[PDB]
Design a protein around this ligand. Structure first.
Ligand SMILES: [Zn+2]
Ligand SMILES: [Zn+2]
Lengths: 262, 235, 488, 129, 313, 67
């Protein structure tokens, strides 16, 4: 259902506070630190983004599946089901609910087994040993644990509404789109309604391009103190990416994962 | 779910926008237009960002000291924006063309509706857009006692009557001239129950139902500091 | 200018349905129906909701009754018990919105023909037991004298704001998720809410106005306690930094050792309010009387540095996320004790000078503090840690007799002199805030202007100024001290 | 002041050198600092008696009580102010005089359901009485 | 993925056969599945055809999780049995189908005044939430009978319902035939690929004329001749050239007055072009509902029900 | 900070609720600041309390007991 965010099941239920996710991640924090878990969530978002890019998909299905990836791991352990199997099954569910089209059975392996051995072979030296019988039970299990919440609102619709109201479209929208694509790495979408993320996006992009957005932001009546920690997360997000590399580290992180028992 | 704040009935940017994330049915949207080409080849959905929409640039440099300094300036000028600046003292003014009717006696049924709603529970903001003003100032006391309106709602109608009379006569001290009409309307009440006791008639109870309320009207009128005390107690 | 500016308070306009208890006297009957219809006006002209009576029509919401109190009580009990226990012409032009997504407050109004009157209150002891729990969970009682109807303004608005304050809206128990799934996060907060270790009847408090914020997250409590006319009862009341909470308690100590248990019993009640929150606290204890020699032995020994660290280790056990994040654990960061007593030595007159003169129309407060070192040159240091004076142009209400037995000649002066001292000053338990400083002058000049601030919350809107001096937790303590004076 | 009560009362019905030398040593000789009036039990030796009070009030060896405690001045506040009854008898003295008079005053001062007392504290909880 | 997770989920799960007597007494059968009457050990229990979740089954569960209205059916609980891998659904029992009233009458004008109102306000709410039913049939209109609410009809069987907020594919690319040929729009019968929300306005006006005459107006190129039969030929979008007055007479033979407010609403409901067709909210601004007796919340208005109970199959 | 400066005298014939803003009253007299809506701090503490499950509070009649 669209056009009414404040009566949606995502807003009523899946908006989870900061203290809730910290308690639920403690069993995952028993083996790895917060930095190792956050870099792992950075990487497995990048895997899902790589799989969505390979299938010639849109961006809306990639963000929804990443939320579906983040919703399950917010409130369940990492050692329950293998995250390497989360990446194909969430993309299929996101493309199914948006009515973009159902992928083929052999196509999805060709989507997966190409990607994990052309850009992620250092992370996975072995093959991807999973079939449809593993996926079909998982997505049937995943919707059972999602509280039947299949409709996800996205910050792109306010962001286009914000830039069409403001007027500057050509010099802001590419800068606005890359920030919202980057903020899906963090957990802000499970914490806040999306239209403050778009407002914090419009605040960042005008400062980056040195655009005087004083009179546009001062007139509107919303809470600016809750924007501030959203700004604070984003500046911590890019700062860790300066001293983080992909190929060097995760030989140790993926060796230290708690693997599910057969 | 009491702990969460809802902006559902709090619109953002009231001149140019509406509710924050509620999307109303715009009747001039792309999903309702039908050209000749749109029917044949289907819906035309193009990417909002030309080039690579999926690509996100993380190698661009950021200056968080610049962002926090600019954000501190934005929140500061909103405090200057939300200030409700001071203004000089002035008499309250009205627009005469829509706030009332010029003639009261055009319809007796409309008066019975308005004073019943005045005796009702509706706050007077809705009643402020249309108020009665009589031919003279004396009928307002007799009619309000007939409906037994509470005095707080009765005194607000008195505040209407002097405001409109001051505006037409601008092209006078309100205390004693209002006091004179109050006293002379209560002076003629004493002519009834004094001489009609000495040779119950229904005309006596007509005077009792209007003297009793207007006397209690006048004491609440007195405690407000609303009229002149000296000439009233002289009467 | 509340009704003039038509402002809206906190609490979002709670609606009140009412029942009126009136005897069969005809002249007394007509004064009430004019009073409560005008009371309906003043409650609704101000933006506080709806003052409509019970929806069933019973002579405009007024019921009748009938030494004679027994006759007044039988029909009080035999009637109020079970009572509290397709054409649509204009609906076609508009459509229905849908299923989409609070019961009104019930406050019974009682008139008192008597000019001991606990027998009218004995109805409320009978109505609390003979009702279902959903009805009886929010029931308030209102008493007014009968002489208000006959002989006299400011009375109508004062009674309106008191009943709106005393509504005390309970926390909802049903959340209406309608998840329609065997398990999920929506059921998880639903199941945790109905767990038997959560208390019932929270009765959330929102006054018509709270203190405005002043620019980590923390909160400071103000608690005040004093004894009754006898030594049988210790009476306490607690407030927030911003006054958003107003709770009090009654603890009995009666003997035919004896004083350590009463001071101990106050503190788990004080620890009760902080543990129903989940942010770390700062505790300030006020005493309306004077601290004696033997009270402070209990106040220092169990509220020491080690024991507050001891309960810090204990609270991490039953709550997991108190172990991880210290900002979500409702611990105590610092402890202080302030004794409150008059001075009665100095006098100032406002009439002597050296655009507005102060005392005839407004009030002001002036403070001087000092470290009061013993000389200029174990757990408890010097008896005055630091002292400061509290002079105020604002007058005070009815104080207890033992408060002014020191120097009663200074009672009747309008600029009133007060003497406040420090007795514990325990900073940085978990290891800058003004309470965290070891400088003894700074911890005075933090709590006292908030003590001035909570005194400004005592402004009756029917009064031009605050109705008395002192903070509201001291005033409400005196409001229940004078009530237990007169009635028992 | 006088007038208001009458009004409502209307409305009810129709509706020797050595003598002064010793007296100077204990009466006018007690002029202490008024900033110490909020005083408490001694910190030097942990007693309700200290400094040079022991010659003004009728043993134990208090050694160099350097704090500002004076039990003479302290007693005045103690006798009729709001205090704990155990603490009140310590300041007076159960063995000496007037401890029996304070006990008699308290016992004559005294000479019901639990939910009704809880009702009394609800009505006075509000802002306006 | 381990054994202890499965026994934890099975313990938290409950069985539909252990709570409901859905076996036997099958009251409804169709291409959507089987409808059973059952209660706790009344409700309408639906089993979807096909092993696993399907295209209709995904469309069912994704929408009515979050939608709620008095005039729309509402689900109370889903069931997922892993023994056979099929989806079980639980709605409240609906006594009378609108097909039953039509078949029994093959007529007071007060109820069809209100049945026209109660569908039209619900379809405006359904359009308001940016989703299309794409299926309006007399078998899809179900009436409460002698229950907690009287009247208050509900719309069900939205297996063909699709969001139209943002079509990433053309709508006819994933569904060439969207509704049965008795109520297919001529617009999509012309091979229109991108079609707007005016399709349902055609469908309600067809079944309203069915309720006006107690006879199917459109009856069995197979229907395009019938569309040109009752409307004449429109002499004033693709494959237009390859196709190779009647309204007044067809209503006259069915004893309906041509000069009436019902006919003026009927003729404005059905047009060849979707732009000149009215949408949902302007239909209820017609004073046809205001005229004389007006739409009631209870469509029976105290009258006893002559229609029988739905017989078990 | 916030001190007191002056006093203004106004007739009671001007104070009426018919006109929507404050015509005889100046908002700069009071230092009125329009601030945005936020939830109650006690209300969010109740929702935040739901995950801790701390020690049981007393049933408020325990305190009124003999020693
Ligand atoms: Zn805890
Ligand atoms: Zn000492």
């Amino acid at each position: 259902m669209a056009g009414n965010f404040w009566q949606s099941s995502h807003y009523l239920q899946w908006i989870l506070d900061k203290q809730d996710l910290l308690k639920e991640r403690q069993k995952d924090l028993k083996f790895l630190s917060e930095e190792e878990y956050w870099k792992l969530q950075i990487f497995f978002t990048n895997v899902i983004q790589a799989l969505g890019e390979h299938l010639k998909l849109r961006q809306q299905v990639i963000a929804t599946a990443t939320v579906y990836f983040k919703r399950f791991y917010a409130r369940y352990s990492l050692k329950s089901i293998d995250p390497v199997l989360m990446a194909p099954t969430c993309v299929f569910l996101a493309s199914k609910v948006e009515e973009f089209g159902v992928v083929s059975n052999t196509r999805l392996i060709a989507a997966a087994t190409s990607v994990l051995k052309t850009r992620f072979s250092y992370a996975f030296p072995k093959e991807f040993p999973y079939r449809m019988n593993h996926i079909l039970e998982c997505e049937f299990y995943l919707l059972e644990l999602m509280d039947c919440c299949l409709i996800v609102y996205h910050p792109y619709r306010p962001l286009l509404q914000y830039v069409q109201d403001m007027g500057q479209e050509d010099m802001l929208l590419p800068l606005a789109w890359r920030i919202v694509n980057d903020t899906y790495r963090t957990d802000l979408c499970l914490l806040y309604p999306p239209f403050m993320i778009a407002l914090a996006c419009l605040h960042v992009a005008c400062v980056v391009q040195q655009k005087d957005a004083r009179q546009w932001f001062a007139e509107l009546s919303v809470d600016m103190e809750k924007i501030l920690e959203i700004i604070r997360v984003i500046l911590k997000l890019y700062e860790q990416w300066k001293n983080f590399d992909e190929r060097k580290e995760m030989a140790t992180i993926l060796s230290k994962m708690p693997k599910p028992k057969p | 779910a009491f702990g969460i704040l809802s902006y559902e009935h709090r619109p953002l940017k009231r001149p140019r926008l509406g509710p924050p994330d509620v999307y109303p049915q715009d009747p001039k949207q792309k999903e309702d237009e039908l050209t000749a080409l749109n029917v044949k080849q289907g819906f035309n959905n193009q990417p909002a960002v030309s080039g690579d929409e999926h690509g996100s640039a993380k190698n661009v440099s950021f200056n968080p000291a610049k962002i926090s300094s600019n954000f501190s300036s934005i929140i500061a000028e909103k405090l200057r924006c939300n200030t409700l600046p001071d203004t000089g003292r002035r008499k309250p003014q009205v627009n005469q063309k829509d706030n009332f009717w010029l003639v009261t006696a055009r319809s007796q049924s409309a008066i019975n509706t308005w004073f019943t709603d005045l005796a009702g529970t509706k706050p007077l903001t809705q009643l402020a857009k249309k108020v009665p003003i009589f031919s003279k100032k004396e009928e307002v006391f007799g009619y309000l006692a007939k409906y037994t309106v509470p005095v707080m709602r009765a005194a607000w109608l008195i505040k209407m009557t002097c405001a409109y009379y001051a505006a037409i006569s601008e092209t006078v001290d309100p205390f004693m001239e209002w006091t004179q009409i109050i006293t002379k309307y209560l002076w003629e009440q004493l002519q009834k129950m004094a001489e009609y006791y000495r040779p119950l008639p229904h005309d006596v109870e007509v005077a009792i139902r209007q003297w009793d309320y207007t006397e209690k009207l006048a004491m609440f009128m007195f405690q407000d500091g609303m009229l002149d005390r000296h000439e009233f107690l002289t009467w | 200018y509340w009704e003039r500016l038509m402002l809206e308070p906190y609490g979002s306009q709670r609606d009140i349905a009412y029942v009126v208890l009136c005897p069969e006297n005809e002249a007394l009957l007509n004064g009430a129906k004019s009073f409560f219809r005008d009371l309906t006006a003043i409650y609704e002209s101000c933006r506080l909701g709806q003052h409509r009576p019970v929806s069933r029509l019973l002579t405009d919401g007024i019921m009748r009754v009938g030494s004679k109190l027994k006759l007044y009580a039988q029909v009080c009990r035999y009637d109020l018990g079970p009572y509290l226990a397709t054409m649509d012409r204009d609906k076609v032009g508009i459509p229905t919105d849908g299923d989409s997504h609070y019961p009104p407050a019930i406050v019974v109004y009682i008139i008192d023909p008597f000019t001991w009157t606990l027998g009218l209150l004995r109805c409320f002891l009978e109505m609390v037991q003979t009702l279902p729990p959903h009805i009886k969970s929010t029931v308030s009682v209102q008493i007014i004298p009968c002489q208000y109807l006959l002989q006299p303004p400011q009375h109508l608005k004062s009674l309106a704001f008191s009943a709106f304050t005393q509504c005390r809206r309970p926390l909802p128990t049903s959340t209406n998720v309608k998840t329609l799934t065997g398990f999920g996060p929506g059921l998880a907060m639903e199941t945790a809410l109905r767990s038997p270790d959560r208390p019932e009847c929270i009765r959330l408090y929102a006054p018509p106005f709270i203190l405005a914020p002043v620019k980590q997250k923390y909160n400071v409590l103000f608690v005040g306690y004093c004894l009754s006319h006898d030594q049988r009862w210790i009476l306490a009341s607690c407030t927030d930094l911003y006054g958003e909470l107003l709770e009090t308690c009654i603890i009995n100590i009666d003997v035919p050792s004896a004083r350590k248990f009463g001071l101990q019993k106050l503190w788990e009640w004080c620890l009760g309010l902080v543990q129903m929150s989940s942010l770390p606290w700062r505790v300030v204890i006020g005493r309306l009387g004077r601290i004696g020699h033997g009270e402070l032995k209990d106040w220092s020994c169990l509220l020491s540095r080690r024991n507050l660290q001891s309960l810090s280790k204990r609270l991490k056990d039953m709550c997991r996320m108190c172990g991880i994040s210290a900002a979500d654990s409702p611990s105590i960061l610092s402890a202080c004790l302030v004794a409150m007593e008059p001075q009665g030595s100095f006098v100032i007159m406002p009439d002597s000078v050296s655009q507005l003169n102060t005392p005839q129309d407004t009030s002001c407060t002036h403070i001087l503090v000092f470290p009061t070192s013993a000389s200029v040159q174990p757990n408890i240091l010097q008896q005055p840690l630091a002292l400061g004076y509290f002079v105020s142009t604002a007058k005070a209400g009815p104080l207890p007799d033992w408060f002014w037995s020191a120097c009663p000649q200074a009672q009747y002066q309008c600029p009133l002199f007060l003497k406040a001292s420090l007795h514990l000053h325990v900073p940085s338990v978990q290891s800058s805030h003004p309470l965290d400083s070891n400088q003894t002058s700074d911890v005075l000049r933090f709590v006292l202007e908030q003590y001035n601030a909570l005194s400004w919350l005592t402004c009756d809107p029917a009064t031009q100024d605050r109705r008395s001096c002192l903070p509201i937790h001291f005033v409400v303590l005196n409001q229940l001290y004078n009530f237990i004076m007169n009635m028992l | 002041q006088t007038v208001d009560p009458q009004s409502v009362q209307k409305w009810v019905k129709f509706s020797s050198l050595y003598v002064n030398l010793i007296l100077s040593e204990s009466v006018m000789n007690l002029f202490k600092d008024c900033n110490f009036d909020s005083c408490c039990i001694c910190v030097c030796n942990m007693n309700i008696k200290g400094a040079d009070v022991g010659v003004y009030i009728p043993q134990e060896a208090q050694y160099r009580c350097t704090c500002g405690f004076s039990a003479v001045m302290n007693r005045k506040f103690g006798n009729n102010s709001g205090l704990f009854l155990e603490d009140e008898l310590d300041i007076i003295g159960r063995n000496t005089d007037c401890g029996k008079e304070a006990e008699k005053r308290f016992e004559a001062l005294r000479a019901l359901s639990d939910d009704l007392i809880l009702l009394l504290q609800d009505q006075c909880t509000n802002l306006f009485s | 993925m381990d054994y202890d997770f499965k026994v934890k989920l099975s313990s938290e799960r409950e069985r539909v056969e252990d709570l409901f007597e859905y076996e036997g007494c099958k009251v409804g059968r169709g291409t959507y599945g089987h409808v059973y009457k059952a209660k706790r050990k009344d409700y309408a229990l639906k089993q979807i055809e096909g092993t696993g979740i399907s295209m209709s089954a995904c469309r069912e569960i994704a929408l009515l999780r979050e939608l709620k209205h008095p005039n729309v059916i509402s689900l109370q609980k889903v069931f997922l049995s892993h023994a056979d891998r099929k989806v079980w659904l639980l709605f409240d029992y609906a006594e009378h189908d609108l097909w039953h009233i039509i078949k029994f009458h093959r007529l007071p004008r007060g109820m069809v005044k209100s049945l026209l109102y109660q569908i039209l306000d619900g379809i405006h709410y359904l359009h308001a939430n940016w989703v299309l039913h794409r299926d309006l049939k007399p078998a899809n209109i179900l009436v409460m009978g002698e229950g907690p609410e009287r009247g208050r009809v509900k719309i069900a069987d939205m297996g063909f319902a699709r969001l139209f907020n943002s079509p990433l594919k053309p709508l006819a690319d994933l569904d060439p035939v969207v509704v049965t040929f008795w109520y297919r729009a001529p617009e999509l019968l012309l091979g229109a690929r991108h079609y707007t929300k005016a399709i349902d306005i055609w469908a309600i006006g067809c079944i309203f004329a069915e309720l006006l005459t107690s006879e199917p107006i459109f009856h069995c190129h197979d229907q395009l001749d019938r569309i040109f039969n009752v409307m004449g030929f429109p002499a004033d979008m693709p494959e237009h050239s390859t196709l190779m007055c009647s309204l007044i007479k067809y209503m006259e033979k069915h004893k309906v007055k041509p000069d009436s407010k019902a006919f003026h609403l009927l003729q404005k409901l059905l047009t060849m072009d979707p732009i000149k067709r009215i949408t949902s909210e302007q239909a209820m601004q017609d004073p046809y509902f205001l005229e004389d007796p007006l739409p009631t919340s209870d469509v029976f208005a105290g009258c006893q029900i002559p229609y029988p109970k739905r017989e078990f199959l | 900070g916030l001190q007191v400066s002056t006093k203004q005298k106004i007739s009671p014939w001007d104070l009426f609720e018919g006109l929507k803003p404050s015509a005889p009253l100046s908002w700069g007299w009071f230092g009125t600041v329009r601030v945005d809506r936020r939830v109650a701090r006690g209300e969010e503490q109740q929702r935040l309390l739901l995950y801790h499950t701390h020690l049981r509070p007393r049933p408020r009649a325990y305190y009124l007991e003999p020693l």
